[PDB]
Amino acid sequence: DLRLHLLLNTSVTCNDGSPAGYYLKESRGSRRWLLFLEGGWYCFNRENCDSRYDTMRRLMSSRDWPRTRTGTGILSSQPEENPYWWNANMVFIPYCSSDVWSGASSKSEKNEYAFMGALIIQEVVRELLGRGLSGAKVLLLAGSSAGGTGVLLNVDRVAEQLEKLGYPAIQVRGLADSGWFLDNKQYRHTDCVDTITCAPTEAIRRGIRYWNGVVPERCRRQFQEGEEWNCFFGYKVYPTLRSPVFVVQWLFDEAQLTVDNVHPVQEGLRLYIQNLGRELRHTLKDVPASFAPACLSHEIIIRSHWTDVQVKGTSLPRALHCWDRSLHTPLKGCPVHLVDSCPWPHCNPSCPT
Ligand SMILES: CCn1c(NC(C)=O)nc2ccccc21
Ligand SMILES: *[C@@H]1O[C@H](CO)[C@@H](O)[C@H](O)[C@H]1NC(C)=O
């Protein structure tokens, strides 16, 4: 089990002003640290954040969090379930800022909610250095869904933070699961006049202003003031990053299809779905560390049966182990770029049911 620690700096808060925190399981014989970012959509104005507070309150507040959690998948300490990093120090950071881990704004007389995701990550790293992170050789910042986009937005800031605090020997890396999305043409269209009809690009643009959201500096310098929403899209922000990043993405991601307004398939929809898979494959062509199976699904790395899916006969735990070796020139029988080429969901027999 992983044990809850609420942040000692209580000015770093969840949406409702309660303290943020992290769950920790130490491994005294290890210099590897895994910090995982939870996902769970986002909210971008008063009305839809109020709704979220009624029926998704654990994603906005720590007041009801449990004292412990069980680590699963890549957070499991059993080699049977986690062939990759079972002996690592394990950290789970709950998502309670509703800002895709981008925010830097406090609750105040002008703000009903706090959006502090970017500062939550910085403070967790800060307090962990006193609990053994100071002796680390590798810090892997991982995450799923909104947490995977959070990795892309924050991995270089963690690297810069540790350099400035005097820890140049810790190698920071990122693992982004199910957070690589396309700002593509939708299958059916609606103008942005309420939460459900607002396309991702419009919703993120409004969210950034509501959250005081922050993006990586090299990407901000390319797109400039008012256009920071571009840096929330994987294929645009990834080429600006300096830390090594492994990208996991289903070719037919359920969250992508939902925002595209897709739910006996006729010709128009067949072509739409086949074109989505091809476009995703194209954005990953020059990503040397990636795992992209041709399945209709969402998230993978903290599921207990995450070891089952394979691309070209290689599982994700194996691909991640090969990535470790490559960062000690490709390796015989140990590949790190794994993208399916077949064009329809479940054309890979190992897709989850
Ligand atoms: C598919 C749309 N989408 C985006 N969009 C971006 C640019 O990141 N972020 C998400 C986070 C959680 C769920 C869905 C999400
Ligand atoms: C608490 O965090 C805030 C926001 O990052 C920071 O400004 C402040 O210095 C921190 N307080 C202490 C005592 O470190």
| Atom in ligand 2 nearest the alpha carbon of residue 122 | 5
Which experiment gave this structure? X-ray
For atom 14 of ligand 2, the residue with the nearest CA is 9
Sign of torsion over alpha carbons 263, 269, 272, 274:
positive
> Would you call 286 a catalytic residue per the annotation?
no
What distance in angstroms lies between residue 146's CA and the mean position of ligand 1's atoms? 6
| Lookup: tokens for 26 | 């130490």
Q: Is 260 a catalytic residue?
A: no
Closest Cα partner for 146 from 331, 257, 299, 18? 299
- The SS3 call for residue 5 is strand
For the CA atoms of 45, 108, 232, 167, the dihedral, rounded to the nearest 10 degrees, stands at -160
First to last CA, the chain: 28
Nearest residue by C-alpha to atom 7 in ligand 2: 11
Q: CB of 21 within 8 A of CB of 62?
A: yes
H or E element, residue 319: helix 316-326
* 223 class by beta-carbon count within 10 Å (0-12 exposed, 13-18 middle, 19+ buried): middle
Q: Resolution to 1 decimal, in Å?
A: 1.6
AA identity, residue 334: C
Beta strand spans in 62-218 (E): 68-69, 89-93, 138-144, 171-177
Structure-token pair, residue 30:
């290890």
Instruction: State the angle between helix axes of 146-165 and 117-129 in degrees (0 to 180), rounded to the nearest 10.
Output: 50
Which of 204, 172, 177, 284 minimizes the C-alpha distance to 238? 284
Residue 145: exposed, middle, or buried by beta-carbon count in 10 A (0-12, 13-18, 19+)?
buried
DSSP state of 238: G
Which atom in ligand 1 lies closest to the alpha carbon of residue 100?
Answer: 11
145 is catalytic: yes
β-strand 245-248 against 296-297: which pairing, if any?
A: unpaired
Structure tokens at 148: 């995977």
Ligand 1 contact via 40 beta carbon (within 6 Å): no
Whether the CB of 255 sits within 6 Å of ligand 1: yes
Contact 63, 291 (CB under 8 A): no
Q: Which of 7, 8, 10, 11 to mutate to test the pocket of ligand 2 (most atoms within 8 A of CB)?
A: 11
Pocket-testing residue among 9, 164, 165, ligand 2, by greatest number of atoms within 8 A of Cβ: 9
